[PDB]
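ping. complex inputs:
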Amino acid sequence: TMMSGRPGRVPLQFLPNEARSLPPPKLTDPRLVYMGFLGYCSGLIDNAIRRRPVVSAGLHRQLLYVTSFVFFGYYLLKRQDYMYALRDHDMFAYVKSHPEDFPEKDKKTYGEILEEFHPVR
Amino acid sequence: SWDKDVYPEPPRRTPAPAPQTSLPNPVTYLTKIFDLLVDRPVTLAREFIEQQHAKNRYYYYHREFRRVPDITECEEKDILCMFEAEMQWRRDYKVDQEIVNIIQERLKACQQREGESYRQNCAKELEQFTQVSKAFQDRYSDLGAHYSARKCLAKQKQRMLAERKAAKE
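pong. complex structure:
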């Protein structure tokens, strides 16, 4: 289950305090813009289902859709970035603490390596 | 305009006109008519256009790429060095293709110019084309549609191993 059993993980915590050391996702993030686009599409489908003008009826409702989607998308992206940073940090620490399992290989240039040539006739 | 060393042309040996009959050669009169009705206006137009070109004289340059370390001096996964070497190798491949093209142009020019004595008078051009073709076929052949510098290196290594085996026998 990988990250579930990490030491110090507080249960039912969306964003740990250590996540604040990471840069927050920019408000112009393409992922956040796509979340807003999903909210707008949800508003359009809500208008379509209730048989009202799709692109004009209920501007407040569509605005609320977009705002909620952007808000939850921002927090979701922050958590995702935190989790990927945790993964990279743990991988780097494990590599550093286990030199034998990840040894540097001899760097032989192509002039030295013999790769067989397969002709195309 | 073109360097005559790159494209050799033999000295022009044109026989002198020595007519024996007194009939008026229609070819001479036709050539004079052509030179009066076509050459003169064409030359005047070219003079005008060349004057206009000389009025606004600007230049263009031949981009020169410096030599880059080859695929031989390139680490296993050094993507940057491999990219540089691959681009240089592709440029060299294009240059060698154009060299073969120049040699083929020489061969065709010799074949046409010599007329009915091309077989004996173009042996040198045939020899040059044979040398260049053998070199090109040794270097760039059987690589396939997905050729790369690593593949030429492999073919060269195979050829050198074969040469060593022949030398040790």
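Chain B has five helices and no strands.
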